[PDB]
Amino acid sequence: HTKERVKLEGSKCKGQLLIFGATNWDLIGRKEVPKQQAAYRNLGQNLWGPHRYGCLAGVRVRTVVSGSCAAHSLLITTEGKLWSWGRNEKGQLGHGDTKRVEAPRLIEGLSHEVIVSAACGRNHTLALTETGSVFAFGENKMGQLGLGNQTDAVPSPAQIMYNGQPITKMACGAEFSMIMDCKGNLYSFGCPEYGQLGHNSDGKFIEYDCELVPRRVAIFIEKTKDGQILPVPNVVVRDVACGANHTLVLDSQKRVFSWGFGGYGRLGHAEQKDEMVPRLVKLFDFPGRGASQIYAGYTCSFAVSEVGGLFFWGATNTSRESTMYPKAVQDLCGWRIRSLACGKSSIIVAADESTISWGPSPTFGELGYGDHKPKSSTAAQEVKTLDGIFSEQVAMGYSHSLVIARDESETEKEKIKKLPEYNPRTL
Template identity: 80%
Template sequence: MPRKKVTEVTGNGGMKKKKPSGKRKERDFSSDDDFDFEQENNKKPGRPAAKSGLQPVTVADDLKEKIKLECPKVKGQLLIFGATNWDLISRKEVPKQQAAFRNLGQNLWGPHRYGCLSDVQVSSVVSGPCAAFSLLITTEGKLWSWGRNDKGQLGHGDTKRLDAPKLIEGLSDQVIVSAACGRNHTLALTDDGTAYSFGENKLGQLGQGSQTDAVLSPATISYNGQPLVKVACGAEFSMVVDCKGNLYSFGCPDYGQLGHNSDGKYIARSNRIEFDCELIPRRVALFIEKSKDGQIMPVPNVVVRDVACGANHTLVLDSQKRVFSWGFGGYGRLGHTEQKDEMVPRLVKLFDFPGRGASLIYTGYQCSFAVNEMGGLYFWGVTNTSRECTMYPKIVQDLCGWKVRSLACGKSSIIIAADESTISWGPSPTFGELGYGDNKAKSSTSAQEVKTLDGVYVEQVAMGYSHSLVIARQDTEQEQDKLKKLPEYNPRTV
């Protein structure tokens, strides 16, 4: 139902931003109190923002909720397939400083067990569409990492690449319940709602109040508000959600991906374009919907329940099962039937009807997914840029009737755990992340069952830029025997 257009909105109010000298001045909006909808309906996009003067979010200790987040109930054995030469992924050549690793790692065309993890029970596995590294969380809540480590994103206090998973000692006294991977940075969430970050921080994506080349060991973000319950990473930005359903963002504001009505660009010396980055978590206070004639209206009562980030865009699922998207609009990944960037979270209309709400959301590098209340999987955006893009959510016909349990998307490939099967597809070139096996098809434009995992019940899937990870159930002797028949991967080391 269309909402009444307004020119003034009341809300929680926000701190005014300081205007730095030497930069083009622009009114910025830190909450819906400051947002003039008449002005916004006629404004030209792409103006630079003023530098944020916000202080870290702080809530008095006696007003904080006391929470205890649970580790995922999943447990099983980790399997890997795809590209494992971590320094070569997404590059034409291994960097000179990593020359010693040039010939380490191979393309695994089918599922492999990690030899070093034979006795480790895994409850969650994490990577991301921009990531050439991965994380796993054990059933005891310990965080392990491996892969590319140019910026310390593995959290071991150095920049040495790791070809096999290793415990992050700096978090060994914490119980980790979830984590997220950006291009070169990591967020980890503890059971008491505290977020740690490490890795690249040139654009403030660690939320620690500074811009530095890299932070090599885990440190808490600059936030003292209500306990956090969700974390997510884009390529160079981050999102966190607190237990009250408030969304906070930090990092690079390019394309409006932080949701603060600005892309943060300004012209520095020598006509160089630079960004006013958000260095600490800042609340995303405004959610909107746009009518067919382009009028902008606020959407009230948004309580965020889940968040997912692509390379430069974000999806949010709220308590009313509505979906919002914003950031880079290219190839239709926002689902608004147009390719415009969105500077603040905008309602995806398809899911704003009774009985049609979303229950799950996922993002790929330049695409988006949602599972609706009826169990239907919807897709929008693009996986293959040489093919036609999908400008708004469309049902994935190949998966009608399947109950999707877990989904992950890398640069262009997709993997899904549904019912008793594992399903994947993706355009060429691929590097084994589809898991079809040696001497089998390397790519597929339509959903295919992964026959190499027949008889293996997959609890959860994750996908990096060009590698896949799955947690395989091993509760029965039959399941254990099936896993033992899979080849073991023991990477060479320098």
């Protein structure tokens, strides 16, 4: 009941940003750009192999950020400064307008803050300061910014309406948000569709009774073999990750919970029903078989177990197949997983000394294989364009990849310099 005071450290990563995949920000996930963006119909291109940004010369990056639903990105510099670029129809870049930005740009409205983390939904963004305060910007039609109201676009960063213990982790779904405090309490806000906010209601009346400020996720449950629903008491959340319409939690006992839309098996409970309350993912409740890391993609889920094995469930290819229960990714047997991301369908992993990627067609370059090389791959492939380059962290939007390339040695710096430089035509 004493309010805790935090000073959060940023990521320990340091390197240069590389990008690959789709960079026509207005075209991503669409057959054509919206009529309003017609001038941009040919701005941006599919980058089939990794590129640097010219505008990032001399800029050292500690965090790269996007989200499986997003056509925008952010980065945090080693000074804790937040920059953003990409699609901006709803103000999700935080630059005070709704104008698309081609290349990384410092967010003036947060330049006096030290930012330690950020998260992206379909059309919104959250940013976390070192003191545990959350700023939100972008679409607020469903209350996903947690500002106490509903508005179509909020293009300038605004502190959320929240007076509890300081926040230490965040995640965003397509039209909702999750924030985790320093005590392990979890709060959600935004669109209640599918029960994705975790309060045992879909809020539907088609209209939604949205949660306009952070609401405590009060109950976590398990289902017994007989079908009995039992509360799991005193869950202390340690991490949270979201796809479009689902959420994963990792708690202090190394247990995984999931809830939201059950379609395609993304919740992992050996069935497809929705869960409107966080539900225990049974596999990770066994002694020594808990999870150490969780990740989410657009319609899928991942966990790395205590002993380091990668598990997947849900669908990377909704047009073809889905997995209803956590399944070991045997192709990565014995590999030490450091970072993982997934977009609509593509997966990228930093493991051992490699970067690994795979996914079905269509792709747009986010696998990183390079020009004149295959565009897709059913199974994991080493990303050979990043030979000799160490990926410290990876991130994905719906159709693009971001990595932090370590640049400590001269050998590394030279390898990174050889990569093409992207200086996109402006406006």
